[PDB]
Design a protein around this ligand. Structure first.
Ligand SMILES: O=C(Nc1ccc(Nc2nc(Nc3ccc(O)cc3)ncc2F)cc1)c1ccccc1Cl
Ligand SMILES: O=C(Nc1ccc(Nc2nc(Nc3ccc(O)cc3)ncc2F)cc1)c1ccccc1Cl
Lengths: 250, 250
């Protein structure tokens, strides 16, 4: 059963992205609440990322996990593309982190567990993510983490393989986890800088430090994840078993 | 200065491809004879290769070499894409090879030289080719070889890196040269078979033999090119210097 814009009542804007906004919406016939992401073809085409989107939509449609935002379907009209998405009521992790400044060890451990599980499910279907940013980590009604950026296959979140033009792997997800884990605990990502040129150098040299309040256990996990060599990074299985994770996660 | 279909008089079909035909055409205002390749958007989009084409057109527009078919420009209407191409009057090498059965050493050496030069120019601009088939090797008015398949970055022409799902390189062009050189001399490519499954195995094992009429010099060149390890293949510079090439090429 195909869709069109007239099938939905559009509510307030949830976010204004670069390629278009995502709105709250309600399917008229069923009253099913959801999110509607509205993209403009001409913009996608001029940026040269329309095919990159079609692939990402193809992958997402296959993925069912409580910590991955569902793609229900999609459609288009003369000038726009529309993605019909699950609605995450509690907003972005980014906003949560701004309000709180930083997260305690149990909230962080819990989120990393949820991410590791989601990525573990993705890994078993041979799917990776370019980038996992807090702006695309959403919260379900019970506060459950939901990955909103779509799967593949500002530099802050990119691993050295990618930025240096090296050969990337399933292991980019492990770096992502280390970046997020740090950002959750200290309130900004470990390679933050005022320029791209400097953020690049820092990612490439793996040059970061920990504030004094970051405990030994978290240091150990974060350091194991943020290895320059992707092969030196652990498997997702091992992150879920790290004593700092098991001691603190739900 | 943009184009449209009304700018051209369309002549007979030069070839009927999968995604559309290429026609002889004459620009009305200038009387400039050329080839017009006509593609259907909906077909490209359904096959999922529209972006692959846009990239290939972007690369080709940059390439100027007497042995690379010129792309003059392009345009589109509601349903079609149009590529404005240089006209190669003497047709495909494939047809030439069918008429002749096989080529002598001097015609072959000459063609490989022309290909090596074209690829050498492409290599210096960091461009490769997925596949170089005789069906996409065209002939200019003086019989000069022109590469018609566009640049990147039936299995007969694909190297083992690609078919095995390995990491490919600039070195795929060297394999291509070895396949063509053989096909030119014997009149069919070295891994030909009645099935894809068998052609695959043969490419992967590098399993071919030479008819008795293929001379030592040609055996030596072809064998150096068709190495399983891409790193073991020579540089284009060395192909142009091979004694069998220099002894026989124009
Ligand atoms: O990425 C951002 N926002 C954002 C917003 C919506 C989406 N997509 C969806 N979001 C929502 N829920 C949501 C609820 C309340 C909010 O305030 C925000 C979101 N559900 C489904 C989505 F696809 C993705 C991302 C963002 C980026 C920079 C700064 C602040 C923010 Cl909130
Ligand atoms: O690929 C084939 N043909 C083909 C035809 C045209 C193009 N494109 C252009 N060709 C031509 N010239 C040409 C002249 C006479 C001919 O009989 C054929 C071509 N110039 C420009 C092209 F873009 C590319 C390829 C082919 C494929 C299988 C069997 C036989 C053939 Cl002739």
């Amino acid at each position: 059963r195909q869709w069109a814009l007239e099938d939905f009542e559009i509510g307030r804007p949830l976010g204004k992205g670069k390629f278009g906004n995502v709105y709250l919406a309600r399917e008229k016939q069923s009253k099913f609440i959801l999110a509607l992401k509205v993209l403009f073809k001409a913009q996608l085409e001029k940026a040269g990322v329309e095919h990159q989107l079609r692939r990402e939509v193809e992958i997402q449609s296959h993925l069912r996990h409580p910590n991955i935002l569902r793609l229900y379907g999609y459609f288009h009209d003369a000038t726009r593309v529309y993605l019909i998405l699950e609605y995450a009521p509690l907003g972005t992790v980014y906003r949560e982190l701004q309000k709180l400044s930083k997260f305690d060890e149990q909230r962080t451990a819990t989120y990393i567990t949820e991410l590791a599980n989601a990525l573990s499910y993705c890994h078993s279907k041979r799917v990776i993510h370019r980038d996992i940013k807090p702006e695309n980590l959403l919260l379900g009604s019970a506060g459950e983490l939901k990955i909103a950026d779509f799967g593949w296959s500002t530099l802050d979140y990119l691993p050295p393989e990618m930025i240096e033009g090296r050969m990337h792997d399933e292991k980019v997800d492990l770096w992502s986890l280390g970046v997020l884990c740090y950002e959750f605990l200290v309130g900004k990502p470990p390679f933050e800088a005022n320029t791209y040129q400097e953020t690049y150098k820092r990612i490439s040299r793996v040059e970061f430090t920990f504030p004094d309040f970051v405990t030994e256990g978290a240091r150990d996990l974060i350091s194991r994840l943020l290895k320059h060599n992707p092969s030196q990074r652990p498997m997702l299985r091992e992150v879920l078993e790290h004593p700092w994770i098991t001691a603190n996660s739900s």
